[PDB]
Design an enzyme around this catalytic site. Structure first.
Site, PDB file in Angstrom:
ATOM      1  N   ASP A  31       3.027  -2.904   9.909  1.00  0.00           N
ATOM      2  CA  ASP A  31       3.484  -1.536  10.151  1.00  0.00           C
ATOM      3  C   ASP A  31       2.268  -0.658  10.421  1.00  0.00           C
ATOM      4  O   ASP A  31       1.442  -0.451   9.530  1.00  0.00           O
ATOM      5  CB  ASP A  31       4.284  -1.018   8.954  1.00  0.00           C
ATOM      6  N   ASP A  60       3.698   3.072  16.404  1.00  0.00           N
ATOM      7  CA  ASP A  60       4.166   2.510  15.141  1.00  0.00           C
ATOM      8  C   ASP A  60       4.911   1.211  15.419  1.00  0.00           C
ATOM      9  O   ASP A  60       6.078   1.236  15.819  1.00  0.00           O
ATOM     10  CB  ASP A  60       5.056   3.495  14.399  1.00  0.00           C
TER      11      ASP A  60
HETATM   12  C1  LIG Z   1      15.334   5.088  11.617  1.00  0.00           C
HETATM   13  S1  LIG Z   1      13.700   4.857  12.361  1.00  0.00           S
HETATM   14  C2  LIG Z   1      13.205   3.126  12.063  1.00  0.00           C
HETATM   15  C3  LIG Z   1      11.898   2.756  11.320  1.00  0.00           C
HETATM   16  N1  LIG Z   1      12.236   1.466  10.754  1.00  0.00           N
HETATM   17  C4  LIG Z   1      12.881   0.447  11.630  1.00  0.00           C
HETATM   18  O1  LIG Z   1      13.106   0.639  12.762  1.00  0.00           O
HETATM   19  C5  LIG Z   1      13.281  -0.934  11.092  1.00  0.00           C
HETATM   20  N2  LIG Z   1      14.449  -1.183  10.427  1.00  0.00           N
HETATM   21  O2  LIG Z   1      14.444  -2.500  10.224  1.00  0.00           O
HETATM   22  C6  LIG Z   1      13.181  -2.943  10.770  1.00  0.00           C
HETATM   23  O3  LIG Z   1      11.972  -2.674   9.835  1.00  0.00           O
HETATM   24  C7  LIG Z   1      10.876  -2.195  10.766  1.00  0.00           C
HETATM   25  C8  LIG Z   1      11.413  -2.201  12.004  1.00  0.00           C
HETATM   26  C9  LIG Z   1      12.957  -2.090  11.718  1.00  0.00           C
HETATM   27  C10 LIG Z   1      11.450   3.757  10.210  1.00  0.00           C
HETATM   28  O4  LIG Z   1      12.113   4.716  10.107  1.00  0.00           O
HETATM   29  N3  LIG Z   1      10.287   3.801   9.220  1.00  0.00           N
HETATM   30  C11 LIG Z   1       9.137   2.919   8.835  1.00  0.00           C
HETATM   31  C12 LIG Z   1       9.343   1.409   9.060  1.00  0.00           C
HETATM   32  C13 LIG Z   1      10.122   0.650   7.915  1.00  0.00           C
HETATM   33  C14 LIG Z   1       9.614  -0.801   7.756  1.00  0.00           C
HETATM   34  C15 LIG Z   1      10.121   1.316   6.506  1.00  0.00           C
HETATM   35  C16 LIG Z   1       7.792   3.408   9.367  1.00  0.00           C
HETATM   36  O5  LIG Z   1       7.257   2.541  10.291  1.00  0.00           O
HETATM   37  C17 LIG Z   1       7.872   4.827  10.002  1.00  0.00           C
HETATM   38  C18 LIG Z   1       6.516   5.536   9.881  1.00  0.00           C
HETATM   39  C19 LIG Z   1       6.294   6.459  11.045  1.00  0.00           C
HETATM   40  C20 LIG Z   1       6.486   6.389   8.597  1.00  0.00           C
HETATM   41  O6  LIG Z   1       7.461   6.951   8.224  1.00  0.00           O
HETATM   42  N4  LIG Z   1       5.236   6.515   7.816  1.00  0.00           N
HETATM   43  C21 LIG Z   1       5.228   7.318   6.650  1.00  0.00           C
HETATM   44  C22 LIG Z   1       5.133   8.783   7.130  1.00  0.00           C
HETATM   45  O7  LIG Z   1       4.319   9.028   7.945  1.00  0.00           O
HETATM   46  N5  LIG Z   1       5.958   9.906   6.699  1.00  0.00           N
HETATM   47  C23 LIG Z   1       7.052   9.827   5.703  1.00  0.00           C
HETATM   48  C24 LIG Z   1       8.258  10.502   6.337  1.00  0.00           C
HETATM   49  C25 LIG Z   1       9.539  10.436   5.428  1.00  0.00           C
HETATM   50  C26 LIG Z   1       7.960  11.951   6.755  1.00  0.00           C
HETATM   51  C27 LIG Z   1       3.971   6.901   5.830  1.00  0.00           C
HETATM   52  C28 LIG Z   1       2.672   7.244   6.560  1.00  0.00           C
HETATM   53  C29 LIG Z   1       3.982   7.519   4.412  1.00  0.00           C
END
Ligand SMILES: CSC[C@H](NC(=O)[C@H]1NO[C@@H]2OCC[C@@H]21)C(=O)N[C@@H](CC(C)C)[C@@H](O)C[C@@H](C)C(=O)N[C@H](C(=O)NCC(C)C)C(C)C
EC number: 3.4.23.46
Length: 378
Positions: A36, A221
């Site tokens: 990730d 990402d």
């Molecule tokens: C609805 S959007 C989809 C995305 N996840 C997915 O698409 C997935 N669902 O099943 C699969 O797992 C990874 C790919 C597939 C996601 O939302 N989120 C995560 C991937 C998962 C593994 C937890 C992260 O890659 C997204 C990333 C940009 C993120 O949120 N980072 C955080 C953030 O920046 N901010 C936190 C947010 C609530 C504001 C960390 C740096 C703390």
């Protein structure tokens, strides 16, 4: 070594993320960790869960140390909390090293683990600035470069269709891409933050304010499946893609990712769906380059059981409130280099690319673009 050893070391299920094999503790426990690039935290499930077939048992590692701290990590969707510790970590099919790395043991999670996903942990390859609960917590890759001679650079090669790819830790494997790499600057070392200077659909400019493309931010990402766009940009593109496809008809819940589309097997009307061109800011003044996306990428396939099997796809461009996210569907078919050393991200056409019959996903430069700096949101 060796790069050949790391080739094909990623696996996945469609729309379920890519994982790599790692081992934690002594004796070594092997787990599947989601790679990730949108996060900075190395974490694994340390407790039983209906969706996990394995987990991290700190009780079985002579090397586990506890930081007597707790952490909570939110994601765009899904969240978890656990206990910070540090143990020894190795990548079977990566560089031949072991390092002491911060590790969060996941004790409780909501909407994070996936039913049937073969990964039980996440590897945040972004920078410390976005680490939780603060940048004090050295992220894995930082630990690896700080404790070894592994160069500060890694490339991801995500192949579609279940699914697999390669994570070349510490270099570039030239057999994995054709053409030349094009580099966009990492605007800032928190996320992998890039500046999108222009957007074209079927050779037509959306003609929006450059800023709209990076409203909030734009990031790469590998952990987000879809291509995620700011509201204004998103609406523009859907309008454009709809017009390109008005010949057929779909529920507007399709364009929302809610419903599904199917066609008689081998009958998909690829021609009516356009190509999307993202122009990324280049390495020299007034210079940019573009990567071109085929519908074979933003139309993701999803198997459905039917008396006639058919071909079914979900619309893989989603609206965003957090900025643009160049997710896995964009990264599939390119060879993406996270050149942390030279503070840039390089793109080339992947060896495992999309292969339309009369169209090609491409990386092309140079393009001239003025006032590129005006595209970063502030
Ligand atoms: C609805 S959007 C989809 C995305 N996840 C997915 O698409 C997935 N669902 O099943 C699969 O797992 C990874 C790919 C597939 C996601 O939302 N989120 C995560 C991937 C998962 C593994 C937890 C992260 O890659 C997204 C990333 C940009 C993120 O949120 N980072 C955080 C953030 O920046 N901010 C936190 C947010 C609530 C504001 C960390 C740096 C703390």
């Amino acid at each position: 070594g060796s790069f050949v050893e790391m080739v094909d070391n990623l696996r996945g299920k469609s729309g379920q993320g890519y994982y790599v094999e790692m081992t934690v503790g002594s004796p070594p426990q092997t787990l599947n960790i989601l790679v990730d690039t949108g996060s900075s935290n190395f974490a694994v499930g340390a407790a039983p869960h209906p969706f996990l077939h394995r987990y991290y048992q700190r009780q079985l590692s002579s090397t586990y140390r506890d930081l007597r701290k707790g952490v909570y990590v939110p994601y765009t969707q899904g969240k978890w909390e656990g206990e910070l510790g540090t143990d020894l970590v190795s990548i079977p099919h990566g560089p031949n090293v072991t390092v002491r790395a911060n590790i969060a043991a996941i004790t409780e999670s909501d909407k994070f683990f996936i039913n049937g996903s073969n990964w039980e942990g996440i590897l945040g390859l972004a920078y410390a600035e976005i680490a939780r609960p603060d940048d004090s917590l050295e992220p894995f890759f930082d630990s690896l470069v700080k404790q070894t001679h592994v160069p500060n650079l890694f490339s991801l090669q995500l192949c579609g269709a279940s699914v697999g790819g390669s994570m070349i830790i510490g270099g570039i494997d030239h057999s994995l891409y054709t053409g030349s790499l094009w580099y966009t600057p990492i605007r800032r070392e928190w996320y992998y933050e890039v500046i999108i200077v222009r957007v074209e659909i079927n050779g037509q400019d959306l003609k929006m304010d450059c800023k709209e493309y990076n409203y909030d931010k734009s990031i790469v990402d590998s952990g987000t499946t879809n291509l995620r766009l700011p509201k204004k940009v998103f609406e523009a593109a859907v309008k454009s893609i709809k017009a390109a496809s008005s010949t057929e008809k779909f529920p507007d819940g399709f364009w929302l990712g809610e419903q599904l589309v199917c066609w008689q097997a081998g009958t998909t009307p690829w021609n009516i769906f356009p190509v999307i061109s993202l122009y990324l800011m280049g390495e020299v003044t007034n210079q940019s380059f573009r990567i071109t996306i085929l519908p074979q990428q933003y139309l993701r396939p999803v198997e459905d059981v039917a008396t006639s099997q058919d071909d079914c796809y979900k619309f893989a461009i989603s609206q965003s409130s957090t900025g643009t996210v160049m997710g896995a569907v964009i990264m599939e078919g390119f060879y993406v280099v996270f050149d942390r050393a030279r503070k840039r991200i390089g793109f080339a056409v992947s060896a495992c690319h999309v292969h339309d019959e009369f169209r090609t996903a491409a990386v092309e430069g140079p393009f001239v673009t003025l006032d590129m700096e005006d595209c970063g949101y502030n």
